[PDB]
């Protein structure tokens, strides 16, 4: 940005150095004010003009604005090219780049609307008369009765208003802190709840009277690949628009306006649409027979600029056939309003406002007008059937009208069309001749420019023989001729045509994100039947034998959108908690897997991408804990559920739990007992595939139908007793019959396309756009995942050894609770300190804290800030002195039973409590006459054989420990320290016979090793039990740990 500043300085020097000194003293404080105002007026698209300005300096200002505009535009495009390819950048760069490209798109839209106002309507009158009379003939062929205006009391207005207000309040239920303009909207919605009939009167008055509307705001959703607009509407108009949306869909569903080929439907998740499309391709009359030169053609395409090229007057003329005319005038009047972005106002006159409530109707009706242009009236009448007996989706009247025409399968998702043709030899030759008559090809150039699917192998995708390529070009030409280019436009570069012939053994398409390859049984090898996931087995309806296979993959745009979502998650700041990142990863991973259920297993690049993104997410937390890279890191830090203090991260990968990390220990009155309890369970095994979920849906709904038919005749109401088998089953879950809102949700028609079009109204992204839980029920179960996750990590006692739990002295876990979704970083680090601060995690570098015996592996400031707070004010030395004084008061009483003549407390040096190179004795006992000593043995060892080495002096030393997950065995530690400190030239002990008592604070363990005179060992066992139960300094340490961890009971 410094080069632009040097350029501005050079421009100002070239301006000021020409004028003399009496004008240098004036124009240094004259030009600089409006110099920024001219650039501001350019950026706000305001025409810059000021009187009293000379013309060469005005041309200099215009050259300055033009040069900075070119620099700014190329900088914005280069910044978008940096973040599109995946290069890392600061978040403020993307936040400014979104505004720059928002202003550029607004300048483009304001230009193209004025170009439409200047050049006139781009549609001719004859094409308008053609589509108008076509719609008239179609609606008179079906006897469609128009949608009436709701007069005074339709007796369903209350339920529709309730549904509209629920869909309006569905967005604001995420966060509990809102803005004032949002509080005003919630207040208006609550006032609409309080008085429904006044709200209905306001809606009907705005319908019959109002034609002017407040300005609609625009924002852009920041996808890394493609910008998408979100519109903001005034709430008083928004309530009326939502009620109009509900009433139009509920009337159009009853009047049967939409033919069954128009998709999405309310019955179907889009993978069911793909499955039924594959079954419809399979079940045709002799579809794979190519012995006489027949061909199959699969066209898929998209209507380019369908949303921007709708003329509003033509829309009103086509809309007045189906509703009341005031309703059509209200639907046209909302589209002609001023769009604002923060400085920029422009009116809308061409193209619809896609972010409206009722706009979900407008796209689905207008695109119906496209079906009369593409499919033809005769073939649409043969597909839909009579009005008194309509056909099903991908079904015909008879077989003769099925095979009477080549255009024999048709489907339209919102703007993507999928057509399937069956040609003979002579029809294909005639179509290729009709193509080559107008478009000759002397050099065979129609191979270059052919869109093909590179994700498949070379023998698996389309083989480009010349006849099949010419047939595909002819098919796309014949479809493109039927559409007037002023109304809609299809393009070859955005389309795809697959051909199945003698030279092409398999058929390809892309639909609903799925890459599908269909391959017949009779075009391949023998029976072998090795079962694979992502392989659908296709069978006939009549003979029920196998005919073909369907191979599923995930397309490239879904994987790129997922990788952009991972890059959005990795844009979290340093103050962001770890749990928010893990929750975003879990939401994204469920939104990937539960939609692409059976096809993630078949594609290998997505399985590599999931593991790569998961390791980047774990590395984001690894760098956040410590700056230095760890050599190892336990997965039980991550995959522990949030109830036990972990993160609850979902798994897609091959992670093996290492041995000797499933061990745990427990100390009781008989001593220290050890116990020993593998792969982390994956997500894809806990989700049903689509094919089994479809076959079971048909079964349970057939059994429901038979049970309902039996229950009607017996005067019996079906209850939970008869349906407690078919629970959790059906595509719409059977569980949805046991809604409280049956009469409420039964009036909601067309909910799936509305849920899909919520993306132009809400600023946040929407995973699970393809479903709604009240209408479908719930489509995954993950309690088994958490159960197997707790079971796979070695149990709760196996997890809690990593978690500093035994430093808190709670007897159980079940009565405990956390102080309140999210856990902070300090509490997480102090909780998982025994498994992070280990020797085999940060290799080599270790230090010691000053006033404690805590060994810090590496350096962790986020744990140091807690270990200073816990162990402040010499608590280590106070605990040591308290244990020494309590044991001295133990040895003070019961004097004659052990023949003790003098107990002596040694002068303890104030650094002795935490130095670990050497030690010294703490409590010295003098024998009255003589004491028999035993061999050096453990505290719990009872096989003691005493020697004749009678000694008088006895010494007792107290040692403290702060261990970790692998080194916390206090018995071998006390034995090693005894054998070290009794066999060295630096430690000082006045007696060769003694004992060392070791206490580990991080797990609260205690043991002893050394010599034993008679009567000393049960006394020391009971004394150390009494101390570990009743030391007040240990109680201060425990209450400080429980205060730091925020863990209560």
């Amino acid at each position: 940005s410094h080069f632009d500043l040097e350029l501005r300085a050079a421009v100002m020097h070239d301006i000021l150095d020409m004028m003399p000194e009496g004008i240098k003293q004036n124009k240094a404080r004259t030009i600089l004010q409006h110099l920024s105002e001219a650039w501001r007026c350019w950026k706000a698209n305001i025409p810059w003009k000021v009187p009293g300005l000379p013309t060469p300096i005005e041309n200099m200002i215009l050259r300055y604005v033009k040069a900075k505009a070119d620099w700014w535009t190329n900088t914005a495009h280069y910044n978008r090219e940096r973040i599109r390819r995946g290069a890392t950048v600061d978040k403020t760069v993307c936040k400014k780049n979104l505004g720059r490209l928002t202003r550029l798109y607004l300048k483009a839209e304001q230009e193209r609307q004025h170009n439409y106002l200047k050049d006139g309507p781009y549609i001719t009158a004859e094409e308008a008369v053609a589509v108008y009379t076509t719609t008239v003939h179609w609606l008179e062929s079906r006897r469609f009765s128009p949608i009436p205006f709701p007069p005074l009391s339709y007796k369903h207005d209350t339920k529709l208003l309730i549904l509209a207000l629920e869909r309006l309040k569905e967005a604001y239920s995420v966060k509990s802190r809102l803005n004032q303009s949002q509080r005003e909207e919630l207040g208006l919605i609550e006032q609409a709840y309080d008085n429904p009939h006044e709200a209905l009167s306001r809606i009907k008055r705005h319908l019959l009277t109002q034609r002017a509307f407040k300005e609609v705001g625009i924002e852009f959703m920041d996808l890394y690949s493609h910008l998408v607009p979100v519109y903001d509407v005034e709430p008083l108009e928004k309530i009326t628009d939502a009620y109009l949306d509900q009433y139009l869909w509920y009337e159009a569903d009853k009047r049967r306006l939409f033919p069954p080929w128009i998709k999405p439907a309310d019955t179907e998740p889009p993978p069911l649409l793909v499955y039924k499309w594959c079954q419809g391709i399979n079940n045709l009359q002799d579809v794979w027979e190519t012995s006489e030169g027949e061909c199959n053609v699969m066209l898929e395409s998209r209507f380019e600029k369908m949303y921007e090229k709708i003329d509003l007057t033509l829309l009103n003329r086509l809309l007045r056939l189906i509703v009341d005319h005031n309703i059509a005038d209200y639907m046209t009047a909302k589209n002609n309003v001023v769009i604002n972005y923060k400085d920029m106002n422009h009116t809308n006159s061409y193209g619809i406002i896609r972010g409206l409530q009722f706009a979900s109707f407008i796209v689905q009706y207008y695109g119906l007008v496209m079906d009369l242009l593409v499919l033809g009236l005769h073939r649409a009448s043969e597909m839909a059937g009579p009005p008194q007996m309509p056909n099903d989706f991908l079904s015909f009247q008879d077989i003769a009208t099925e095979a009477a025409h080549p255009i024999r399968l048709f489907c339209r998702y919102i703007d993507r069309i999928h057509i399937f043709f069956r040609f003979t030899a002579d029809e294909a030759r005639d179509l290729i001749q009709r193509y080559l008559t107008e478009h000759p090809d002397p050099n065979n150039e129609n191979i270059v420019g052919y869109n093909n699917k590179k994700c498949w192998p070379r023998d698996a995708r389309m083989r480009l023989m010349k006849h099949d390529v010419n047939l595909g070009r002819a098919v796309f030409w014949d479809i493109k001729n039927r559409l007037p280019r002023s109304v809609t436009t299809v393009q070859w570069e955005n389309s795809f045509v697959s051909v199945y012939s003698k030279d092409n053994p398999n058929l390809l398409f892309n639909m609903c994100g799925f890459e599908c390859r269909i391959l017949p049984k009779c075009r391949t090898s023998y029976e072998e039947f090795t079962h694979k996931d992502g392989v659908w087995n296709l069978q006939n309806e009549v003979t029920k034998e196998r005919t073909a296979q369907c191979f599923l993959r995930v397309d490239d745009e879904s994987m790129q959108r997922f990788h952009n979502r991972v890059r959005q998650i990795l844009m979290a700041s340093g103050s962001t908690t770890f749990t928010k990142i893990v929750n975003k990863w879990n939401t994204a991973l469920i939104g990937l897997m539960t939609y692409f259920r059976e096809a993630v297993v078949n594609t290998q690049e997505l399985l590599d991408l999931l593991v790569k993104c998961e390791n980047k997410i774990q590395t984001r937390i690894k760098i956040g804990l410590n700056s230095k890279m760890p050599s190892r890191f336990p997965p039980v830090v991550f995959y522990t559920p949030k109830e036990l203090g972990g993160l609850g991260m979902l798994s897609m990968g091959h992670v093996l739990i290492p041995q000797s990390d499933l061990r745990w220990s427990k100390q009781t009155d008989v001593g220290i007992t050890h116990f020993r309890s593998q792969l982390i369970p994956n997500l894809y095994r806990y989700i049903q595939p689509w094919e089994s979920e479809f076959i079971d849906s048909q079964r349970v709904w057939a059994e429901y139908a038979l049970k309902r038919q039996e229950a009607i005749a017996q005067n019996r109401r079906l209850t939970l007793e008869d349906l407690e088998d078919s629970w959790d089953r059906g595509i719409p879950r059977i569980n949805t019959l046991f809604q409280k809102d049956r009469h409420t949700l039964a009036y909601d028609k067309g909910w799936r396309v509305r849920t899909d079009f919520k993306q132009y109204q809400v600023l946040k992204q929407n995973p699970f756009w393809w479903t709604h839980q009240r209408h479908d029920g719930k489509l995954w179960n993950l309690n088994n995942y958490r159960t197997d996750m707790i079971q796979a990590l070695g149990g709760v006692e196996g997890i809690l050894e990593h978690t500093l739990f035994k430093g808190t002295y709670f007897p159980t876990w079940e009565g405990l609770f956390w102080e309140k979704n999210q856990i902070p970083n300090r509490r997480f680090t102090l909780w998982w300190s025994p498994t992070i601060n280990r020797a085999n995690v940060y290799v080599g570098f270790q230090v010691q804290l000053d006033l404690t015996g805590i060994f810090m592996h590496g350096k962790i400031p986020t744990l140091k800030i807690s270990l200073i707070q816990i162990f402040r004010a010499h608590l280590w030395q106070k605990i040591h002195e308290s244990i020494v004084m309590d044991l001295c008061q133990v040895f003070d009483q019961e004097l004659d039973a052990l023949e003790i003549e003098t107990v002596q407390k040694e002068t303890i040096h104030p650094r002795k409590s935490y130095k670990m190179n050497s030690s010294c004795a703490d409590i010295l006992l003098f024998a009255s006459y003589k004491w028999n000593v035993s061999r050096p043995s453990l505290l719990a060892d009872s096989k003691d054989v005493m020697d004749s080495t009678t000694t008088q002096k006895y010494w007792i030393d107290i040692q403290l420990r702060w261990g970790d997950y692998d080194s916390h065995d206090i018995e071998r530690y006390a034995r090693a320290k005894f054998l070290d400190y009794t066999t060295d030239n630096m430690s000082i002990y006045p007696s060769p016979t003694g004992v060392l008592i070791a206490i580990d604070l991080a797990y609260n363990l205690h043991s002893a090793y050394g010599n034993w005179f008679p009567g000393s060992k049960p006394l020391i066992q009971q004394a150390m039990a009494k101390i570990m139960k009743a030391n007040p300094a240990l109680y201060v340490l425990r209450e400080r740990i429980r205060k730091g961890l925020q863990l209560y009971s």
Binding site: I447, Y450, N452, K454, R458, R461, M462, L464, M465, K466
Partner: protein
Amino acid sequence: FEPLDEDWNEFNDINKIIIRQPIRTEYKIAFPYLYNNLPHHVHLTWYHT
């Protein structure tokens, strides 16, 4: 060395190609213009002494 994606055609049809002897790399190196597509920076080797 490090390096310095083709659809099916009428040209590279394997039903037309008679597979008799497997073509190796040294065949493409000895005669770099007969067995190679896109021969950008090849050198003509010395034939015989």
